[PDB]
Amino acid sequence: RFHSFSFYELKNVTNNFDERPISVGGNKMGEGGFGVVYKGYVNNTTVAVKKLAALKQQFDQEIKVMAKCQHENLVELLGFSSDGDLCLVYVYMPNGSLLDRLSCLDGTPPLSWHMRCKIAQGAANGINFLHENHHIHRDIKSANILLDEAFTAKISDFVGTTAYMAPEALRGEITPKSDIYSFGVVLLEIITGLPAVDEHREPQLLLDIKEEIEDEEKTIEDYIDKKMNDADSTSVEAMYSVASQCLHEKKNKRPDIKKVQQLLQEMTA
Amino acid sequence: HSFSFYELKNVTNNFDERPISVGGNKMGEGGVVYKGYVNNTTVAVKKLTTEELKQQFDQEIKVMAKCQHENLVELLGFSSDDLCLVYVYMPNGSLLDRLSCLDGTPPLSWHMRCKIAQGAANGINFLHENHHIHRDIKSANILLDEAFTAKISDFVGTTAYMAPEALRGEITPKSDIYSFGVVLLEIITGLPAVDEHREPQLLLDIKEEIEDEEKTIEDYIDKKMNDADSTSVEAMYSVASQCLHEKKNKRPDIKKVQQLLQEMTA
Numbered sequence A: 001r002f003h004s005f006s007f008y009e010l011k012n013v014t015n016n017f018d019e020r021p022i023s024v025g026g027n028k029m030g031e032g033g034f035g036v037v038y039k040g041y042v043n044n045t046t047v048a049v050k051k052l053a054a055l056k057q058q059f060d061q062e063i064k065v066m067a068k069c070q071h072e073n074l075v076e077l078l079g080f081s082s083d084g085d086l087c088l089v090y091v092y093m094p095n096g097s098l099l100d101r102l103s104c105l106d107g108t109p110p111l112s113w114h115m116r117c118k119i120a121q122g123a124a125n126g127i128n129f130l131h132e133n134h135h136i137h138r139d140i141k142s143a144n145i146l147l148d149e150a151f152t153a154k155i156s157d158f159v160g161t162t163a164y165m166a167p168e169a170l171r172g173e174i175t176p177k178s179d180i181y182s183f184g185v186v187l188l189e190i191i192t193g194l195p196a197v198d199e200h201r202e203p204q205l206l207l208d209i210k211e212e213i214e215d216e217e218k219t220i221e222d223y224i225d226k227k228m229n230d231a232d233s234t235s236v237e238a239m240y241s242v243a244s245q246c247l248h249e250k251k252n253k254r255p256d257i258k259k260v261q262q263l264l265q266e267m268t269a
Numbered sequence B: 001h002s003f004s005f006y007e008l009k010n011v012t013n014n015f016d017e018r019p020i021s022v023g024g025n026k027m028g029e030g031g032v033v034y035k036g037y038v039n040n041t042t043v044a045v046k047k048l049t050t051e052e053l054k055q056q057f058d059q060e061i062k063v064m065a066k067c068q069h070e071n072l073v074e075l076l077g078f079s080s081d082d083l084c085l086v087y088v089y090m091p092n093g094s095l096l097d098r099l100s101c102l103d104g105t106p107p108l109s110w111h112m113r114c115k116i117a118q119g120a121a122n123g124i125n126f127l128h129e130n131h132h133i134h135r136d137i138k139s140a141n142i143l144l145d146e147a148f149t150a151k152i153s154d155f156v157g158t159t160a161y162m163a164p165e166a167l168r169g170e171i172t173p174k175s176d177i178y179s180f181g182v183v184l185l186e187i188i189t190g191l192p193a194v195d196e197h198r199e200p201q202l203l204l205d206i207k208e209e210i211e212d213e214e215k216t217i218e219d220y221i222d223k224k225m226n227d228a229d230s231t232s233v234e235a236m237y238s239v240a241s242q243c244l245h246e247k248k249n250k251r252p253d254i255k256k257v258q259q260l261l262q263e264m265t266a
Ligand SMILES: O=C(Nc1ccc(CN2CCNCC2)c(C(F)(F)F)c1)c1cccc(-c2ccc3nc(NC(=O)C4CC4)sc3n2)c1
Pocket: A029, A037, A048, A050, A062, A065, A069, A074, A075, A090, A091, A092, A093, A094, A095, A096, A097, A130, A135, A136, A137, A138, A146, A155, A156, A157, A158
């Protein structure tokens, strides 16, 4: 069940929706339009308030999905306001996204291998919940994986992103198997610490490194994030194997999200 | 101090040639540098084409005897009876290791990168006043202690750090200044000096992209800092830019670099 929020209840708590960045002490921490995400504090809980701008029934279906969607590995919707803009209230995730932490943004220490494994397993569980409930994320990426106080993975969503998209998704297909492909790219980011796309890099797309390893021009060890001291070759190769299978160009020969969960658990066992 | 050979052999586990990450004593190639512990001191032992070497040994000692400074590595002794050189071990590895956060170590802050820059300059300044040419200034040659004090070491150039005139043969202190400019860009960007799978492959080339106003320095600043303010970053890029003048006579000397770096801290 959701809590009843007034627009003026949220306007007040976001400091009149302060549009200064949070780095300077303001309340705006996202321009992920359509809509703006502000930092707030309601019900003795830090929150992320999404003020939708110029679209109404997406505000509805986003509630329709987040109402039934309550899982340990998803973001949590606290409520909303339909008063005279429209806003949604999410619980704030202090540790930001997996992208920010993989790149060690703002000086945060590198995630360990063990922490990376757990986050991968968590992301799979959240994705599995979406698939079990016949939902397609369509925008699976490290920037959409948020982390809490305990660094547990939380699938979120602020078409898709080209560096993460499957061939069929690039051709218009809408399938859960496209999410499995996107997740495979994410699994490579976790292993390598590299962004999915780097304009000034060879290859420009992280998914291409799969080729250099298959044609034995490179090995997996050459690409492993050096910002780790606890990464053993066995489990790293295990996660790469899973990422390889997810990145099969033929959607029918990719594993389902359930097999991924299984393979990621056998990895740490 | 004079060490007997069997001494150093004992404390390096008989010169274990395996890297330290395997459980060996080898820290660098290639003579080879071994890790050892003797007389309340962790030490880096360098074990060194026959009598051509004996003066290379002496020259190193000759140069390192006169040179005791806060920002240079510390020669502890040697072994005359193979030939070995004993330096004081530096626990935080090189500036290169820490810029790339090797083995999960936390990113160096902007403030700390600045002090390391100043210290390295002071070490180069000391070398130049005593009429020495390093010939190989790189981030791998800048070691760090427990307090992250910059210590200049020497294990021609590397190519990614080399000045154009040095690439053609000229041996001058002005080339060290150029190589230092590349180190400064490393400090700013966190990027390695050369990456063959990168465009541009050479970090010194980003100087062109910026003065061609395609890109700005802010586009290259290391994301792994939260305290880097725009003013001092551009202040340091300015110093790096001047060091990287293709014309050796238009490059500042090491003393002007010191003054410029101190001016940046304010
Ligand atoms: O995820 C959101 N909504 C949503 C919408 C739909 C779906 C369903 N999909 C739609 C596609 N088809 C079906 C699947 C889902 C889904 F996928 F989760 F179910 C999630 C959402 C929206 C707004 C804000 C937030 C939000 C949460 C925490 C948070 N913590 C922050 N802290 C920081 O940044 C710290 C300063 C570093 S910012 C922040 N923002 C999250």
